[PDB]
Amino acid sequence: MAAVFGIQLVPKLNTSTTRRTFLPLRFDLLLDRLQSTNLHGVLYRALDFNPVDRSATVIQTYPPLNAWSPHHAFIENPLDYRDWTEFIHDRALAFVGVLTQRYPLTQNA
């Protein structure tokens, strides 16, 4: 311990004991998540600078959304965070419908 290169550690060790189990992906639950309107604090951790009606830095995408990359730069960045909210709300909304076309809840729950 302690003098780890130029990183001074503490005299005290500390651990955590309990960890959670990896719970499955309910179809219902995604349908619900895809339905998010106020997305900002749902399928991602989104940073905005609200006071002057402006964006911050980083939309930290979750699952879903985790399959963004292939051509991300091609897409270019939207005008603001607030604006990006909308857009992917929109598009997501379109997508949920696609899924449903092929899979009926009633049947698939």
Note the main attributes of this structure.
alpha+beta; 109 residues; two-stranded antiparallel sheet; 17% strand; 1 chains; 4 strands
Task: Kindly describe this structure.
- With 109 residues, the chain is α+β, with helices and mostly antiparallel strands.
- The protein has 3 helices and 4 strands; from the N terminus they run ββαββαα.
- A two-stranded antiparallel ribbon has the order 1-2. A two-stranded antiparallel sheet has the order 3-4.
- It is classed as virus.
Topology:
Layout: E1 3-4, E2 7-8, H1 27-34, E3 44-49, E4 54-61, H2 81-102, H3 105-108
Antiparallel strand pairs: 1-2, 3-4
PDB class: virus
Keywords: cryoEM, bioinformatics, structure-based refinement, macromolecular assembly, GCRV virion, virus
Entry title: Backbone model of an aquareovirus virion by cryo-electron microscopy and bioinformatics
Give the radius of gyration: 20 Å
Q: β content, as a range?
A: 15-25%
Give the oligomeric state of the chains in this entry, treating copies of one chain as homo and distinct chains as hetero.
part of a larger assembly
| SS elements, strand count | 4
| SS content category | alpha+beta
H-E order = EEHEEHH
- Biggest β-sheet description: 2 strands, antiparallel
Distance between termini? Answer: 52 Å
Q: What form results from the Cα inertia axes?
A: extended
Order the strands across the largest sheet as they lie in space: 1-2
Q: Can you give the helix content as a percent range?
A: 25-40%
**Count of separate DSSP helical elements:** 3
PDB class: virus
Keywords: cryoEM, bioinformatics, structure-based refinement, macromolecular assembly, GCRV virion, virus
Entry title: Backbone model of an aquareovirus virion by cryo-electron microscopy and bioinformatics
Name: VP1
